[PDB]
């Protein structure tokens, strides 16, 4: 496990473009449909741009390594990738929180989640993600940056999970009352939403934990050797995200079929 697994410079760009195209159409579907100008679809549009950057930034970076001041260009692309990651994880949380407000603040929703606040929240997220990304790359050698990235992910994974489980428990409480008149679908959709996020992201943050906890332990280095394979799983996430979020609504899928 002394050497690190080599993934073809071509397996990165291909998942880079298949993601890129799939993400642009999702923005067009929301841009060209005024019926999809609800606060819900703005957070999905935020994820679509976040997911689009992860693929392009990682894609753009496999071409520069193949072709090739290199330290600068290199620190700029990393800052775009790091900013894209945090924006992607924040956008997923934003969708989860938005949905939670539509069920548990059903009658108060449109007083809370106004177009002005949605605009502020999305803008305030992206501003905090970009500043966070740039700062992390500048102080990359520092240990604190890694601990903050791990704490960020596991707190936002915990909250995202908690919000969806509580929404499922409320859905199950309704199914009990509808069944009394003269459940698996909820379980399947929840398993996909949480499962896809964990399987795609967790390996990267597990790598970071092993990068700090046990740099020298023989069972850790063998895990840390598949860093590229974890980066491919991060791009696979951005490819799958549109299918499980945007394309699951009838109106957006009807606009996608039209275009």
């Amino acid at each position: 496990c002394y050497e690190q697994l080599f993934v073809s410079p071509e397996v990165f760009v291909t998942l880079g473009v298949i993601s890129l195209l799939e993400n642009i159409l999702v923005i067009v579907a929301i841009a060209k449909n005024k019926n999809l100008h609800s606060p819900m679809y703005f957070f999905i549009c935020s994820l679509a741009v976040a997911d689009m950057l992860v693929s392009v930034s990682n894609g753009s970076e496999t071409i520069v390594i193949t072709l090739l001041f290199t330290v600068n260009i290199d620190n700029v692309i990393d800052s775009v990738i790091c900013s894209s990651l945090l924006a992607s994880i924040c956008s997923l949380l934003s969708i989860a929180v938005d949905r939670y407000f539509t069920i548990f603040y059903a009658l108060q929703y449109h007083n809370i989640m106004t177009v002005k606040r949605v605009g502020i929240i999305i803008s305030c997220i992206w501003a905090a993600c970009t500043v966070s990304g740039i700062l992390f790359i500048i102080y990359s050698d520092s240990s604190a940056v890694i601990i903050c990235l791990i704490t960020m992910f596991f707190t936002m994974l915990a909250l995202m999970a908690s919000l969806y489980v509580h929404m499922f428990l409320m859905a199950r409480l309704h199914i009990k009352r509808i069944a009394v008149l003269p459940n698996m679908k909820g379980a399947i959709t929840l398993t996909i939403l949480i499962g896809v996020f964990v399987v795609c992201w967790a390996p990267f943050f597990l790598h970071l934990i092993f990068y700090i906890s046990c740099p020298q332990n023989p069972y850790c280095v063998c895990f840390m050797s598949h860093f590229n394979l974890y980066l491919i799983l991060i791009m696979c996430n951005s490819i799958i995200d549109p299918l499980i979020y945007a394309l699951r609504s009838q109106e957006l899928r009807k606009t996608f079929k039209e275009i």
């Binding site: 990165f12 970076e61 390594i65 990393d78 990738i81 790598h207």
Partner: peptide
């Protein structure tokens, strides 16, 4: 020098 990403 990390081939891809950072902290590889």
């Amino acid at each position: 020098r990390c081939x891809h990403x950072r902290w590889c």
